[PDB]
Hints:
protease inhibitor; 15 strands; globular; serine-type endopeptidase inhibitor activity; Antithrombin, Chain I, domain 2; about 25% helix; immunity; 9 helices
Amino acid sequence: GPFQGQRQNEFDLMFVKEIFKNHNSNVVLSPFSVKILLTLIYEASDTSFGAVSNTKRELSSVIQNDNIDHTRSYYKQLLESAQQDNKDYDLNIATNFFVDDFIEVINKYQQIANTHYHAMLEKVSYSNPTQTAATINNWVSEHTNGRLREIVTPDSLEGAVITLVNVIYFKGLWTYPFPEVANNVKPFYGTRGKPTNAQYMEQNGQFYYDNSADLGAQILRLPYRGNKLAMYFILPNPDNTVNQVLDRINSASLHQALWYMEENEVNVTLPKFKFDFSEQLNEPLQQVGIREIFSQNASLPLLARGEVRVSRIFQKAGITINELGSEAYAATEIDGVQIFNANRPFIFFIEDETLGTMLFAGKIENPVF
Length: 369
């Protein structure tokens, strides 16, 4: 069943809103993974001792009671709950610092990064951007089972000394798969311009659902097999846009909107989509107040043997939904109805329902499959 606790998603929702407001395209990212990146940077900073600085201060809403033992066990527990090896789904979060030749990585830091944050550090030579780009891109492929093939070009490494890269990959099956229909194209009414077309899937089922008066949107939950993950969809009522619904969403208002959902008979129509989304996170992080780590006053003394700072942060994520699930092509197993018909733009997210973790967040402006 749905998560009954309070999600620690204040930062997640803030950062998601910043990304969405600046891209007029489909978007998908992993807000939880962004917090992992920020916490690794926190761990690398001198500031992080229970000592003060604008770095320690700004990385705040991501750190746990500014107590490092708690921070490690917290993020470690959430990473392991999400990525738990199991027969039902495959989820992998991968994170690497790619560090220039001349930098000496502190061993105790590689230890903490691997153990608590399931992150690693590798040496490269930025004096050879071409070789380095190849190294980073092959790492992306290897850690996403080829779902993602590249994330940087030589040009995006220009001037870099440390690049922090995160990717995420997820394969899963719907608990309730859609019937497969060969031909089901219909119009899709995008936010701007004339309608486009999409390929749709439709079923009747019992799902947690509500038409939220507060948000001005319908909300729907489709669970994946494994008793852990579910995808939520927030579909603005026709009177409202994704941007208007976004402005209404915050931790408390999303808490209540999900709280109001209950199991209903629902006829669900969703457009199929497959896409990926890559971004350098420097600019959006700066926009939401995380600035000191990109400043001339930044340092990483607990990562790099002594001043260097993170040059660029990249994140990439791919997402697919079809009748069977996400990256799914086989399924060993197959009047008061409410109607949820997503033929206009909507928001979605995938959550660990045992802990509240916002593992994926995205929006569909033009679904292409």
